[PDB]
């Protein structure tokens, strides 16, 4: 037995009423639960028997159920909520999980704060060299950072990451990191990465010079 | 009502390994217990249970064969013994049980224990400053295998402001990660800031000053 769960992700405000869905293969009576997972713990029981709120959870968690059909309601979603929760059926052995809704706090857009690190001498002399781009405190999640050395942009010399959601300000953070050798690193002299974000007017750069 | 699990680690592809579960406030006599895994990024995946009582099993499809579940009511705790272990292992483990005989679903979950299946020796990381020069400044956490390692600042008592990164995996298998904090412009150079960098499964501990 399947448990098909929509949506994959979805983007609510605080105070907003939230509907995931989930739909079974084939009927699965009520023997349904739905479980919130934070990131770095363990998953979470919130919903037994398809209707029935576990014990501790807030009361703006409520499940119902219509035939196959199985939905999750927070009624006034709270910045705390961010997670992936997951439908599960126990109907028959082996029990199967939904595969997933990420919840994202909804908030208005923020510019991110960028800064560039050059690489340390220190690694430097071990013979590697890499370049960090940061951005601080943005919304939303979507932004395109790119790398330029000598005004020439880059492909495949970077890796990005992201931070999960902020507690507080529901905001992001990335770091975009270009790594190159020594030798490829001493031989250019501006390091820029380029930030594309719906809270800048337009692209902001930031760079150095090399030695400078 | 606890769930305490053990013994996942590092292990090379192909062999052997035995996590435990022991319950604390029940008895497991008295309920199913549960394995469920999560693979990097990946949703939930239900392994094995088992009814101590009379020791009847089940397995997934994927691990029949090659694990073993097991469970000693005496000493109120669960096993399972994973045998010609493969990179698609990889994954945390989770313990669980059938609360109220299934009604209540998998109510308690163990914290999860961490899997590595990889042939890759153990290696700790290299710390070098992002220096700085409202100002952002941090620690690029280098070349470490396996996952995990912690970061603080100041041995916990700069904590707003922080963001430590998820580790990527670099081209070369060895993992990378930065942790920044954004500080006062005018507190550089008199106020000082150090990384404490843990790495358990090398045994490496390293605190680093940043310095502009």
């Known amino acids: 037995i399947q448990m098909t769960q929509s949506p994959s992700s979805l983007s609510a405000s605080v105070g907003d009423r939230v509907t995931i869905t989930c739909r079974a293969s084939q009927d699965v009576n009520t023997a349904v639960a739905w479980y919130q997972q934070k990131p770095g713990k363990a998953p979470k029981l919130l919903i037994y028997s398809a209707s029935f709120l576990y014990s501790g959870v807030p009361s703006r968690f409520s499940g119902s159920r219509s035939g196959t059909d199985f939905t999750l309601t927070i009624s006034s979603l709270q910045p705390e909520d961010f997670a992936t929760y997951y439908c599960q059926q126990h109907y028959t052995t082996p029990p199967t999980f939904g595969q997933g809704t990420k919840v994202e706090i909804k908030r208005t857009v923020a510019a991110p704060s960028v800064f560039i690190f050059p690489p340390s001498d220190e690694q430097l002399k071990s013979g590697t060299a890499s370049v960090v781009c940061l951005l601080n405190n943005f919304y939303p999640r979507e932004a395109k950072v790119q790398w330029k050395v000598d005004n020439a942009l880059q492909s495949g010399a970077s890796q990005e990451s992201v931070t999960e959601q902020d507690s507080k300000d529901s905001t992001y953070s990335l770091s975009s990191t270009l790594t190159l050798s020594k030798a490829a690193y001493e031989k250019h002299a501006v390091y820029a990465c380029e930030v594309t974000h719906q809270g800048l007017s337009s692209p902001v750069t930031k760079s150095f010079n090399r030695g400078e | 009502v606890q769930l305490v699990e053990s013994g996942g680690g590092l292990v090379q592809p192909g062999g052997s390994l035995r996590l435990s579960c022991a319950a604390s406030?029940?008895?497991?006599?008295?309920?199913?217990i549960h394995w469920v895994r999560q693979a990097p990024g990946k949703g939930l995946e239900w392994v094995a249970r088992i009814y101590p009582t009379n020791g009847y099993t089940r397995y997934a499809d994927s691990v029949k064969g090659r694990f073993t579940i097991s469970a000693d009511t005496s000493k109120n705790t669960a096993y399972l013994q994973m045998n010609s272990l493969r990179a698609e292992d990889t994954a945390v483990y989770y313990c669980?049980?059938?609360?109220?005989?299934?009604?209540?679903?998998?109510?308690?979950w163990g914290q999860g224990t961490l899997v590595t299946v990889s042939s890759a020796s153990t290696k700790g990381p290299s710390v070098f400053p992002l220096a700085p020069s409202t100002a952002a400044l941090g620690c690029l956490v280098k070349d470490y295998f396996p996952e995990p390692v912690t970061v603080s600042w100041n041995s916990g008592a700069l904590t707003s402001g922080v963001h430590t990164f998820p580790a990527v995996l670099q081209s070369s298998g060895l993992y990378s990660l930065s942790s920044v904090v954004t500080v006062p412009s005018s507190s550089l150079g008199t106020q000082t800031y150090i990384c404490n960098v843990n790495h358990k499964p090398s045994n490496t501990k390293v605190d680093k000053k940043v310095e502009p």
């Open positions: 406030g029940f008895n497991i006599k008295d309920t199913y």
């Open positions: 669980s049980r059938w609360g109220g005989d299934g009604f209540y679903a998998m109510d308690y």
